[PDB]
Each structure stands twice: as C-alpha cells, then as structure tokens.
C-alpha cells in the first residue's frame, strides 16, 4: 500500500513532467539496500569475451 500511495501521487506529478518523461514511462520498485547474492559466469578457456 506504500507503493500504491507512491504511484498515486506520482500520477499527479507526471503532467508537469516533460512530454518525453511521459512518453518514456517511469517505474516504481520496492527498494532493498543490501545485495543478497551475485550470480555470475566466467570463461574458463578464455574463448568468449566479456
């Protein structure tokens, strides 16, 4: 319901924003400070690049 209230007031915020900020679309996400786990892949043979 906090996300609900945030993107309720963001709807009133969006008309004074520029046209391009309106055509692009802005996103609302619940923020978590820490990183749980980094999952990454490497290249053993040195063949495929970054």
């Amino acid at each position: 319901i906090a996300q609900v209230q945030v993107q309720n007031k963001l709807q009133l915020a969006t008309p004074l924003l520029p046209q391009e900020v309106q055509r692009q679309g802005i996103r609302v996400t619940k923020a978590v400070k820490n990183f749980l786990m980094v999952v990454g892949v490497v290249s053993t043979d040195g063949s495929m690049t970054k």
């Binding site: 004074l16 924003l17 520029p18 046209q19």
Partner: protein, 51 residues
C-alpha cells in the same frame, strides 16, 4: 484555440509554451477573416474566400 507546443525551463522550473492569435484579432465574426492560409503555389489565400 491555444496549443501546447513544448516546455521551457523558467527559474529552474518547467513551464510550457502556448500560442494563439492576438486578443483583438478573434473577437468578432468579422475578425475571423484576417487569418490567411498558405496556398501550395506560394501566395496567401483569404479565409472568407472559402470558409
């Protein structure tokens, strides 16, 4: 009628840009014949010629 063209920054805050005709050039039905519309050949066409 007016028309929202685009925005402009003013005092570090976003405001918009409208454009109309002058306040003394749309008041009467006779003042709606001043507005000229461009022909494809180049010259101007009056507005009480057709409308």
């Amino acid at each position: 009628g007016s028309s929202y063209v685009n925005d402009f920054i003013d005092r570090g805050r976003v405001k918009r840009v409208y454009l109309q005709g002058r306040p003394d050039a749309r008041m009467n039905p006779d003042d709606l014949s001043k507005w000229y519309v461009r022909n494809d050949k180049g010259e101007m066409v009056p507005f009480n010629a057709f409308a």
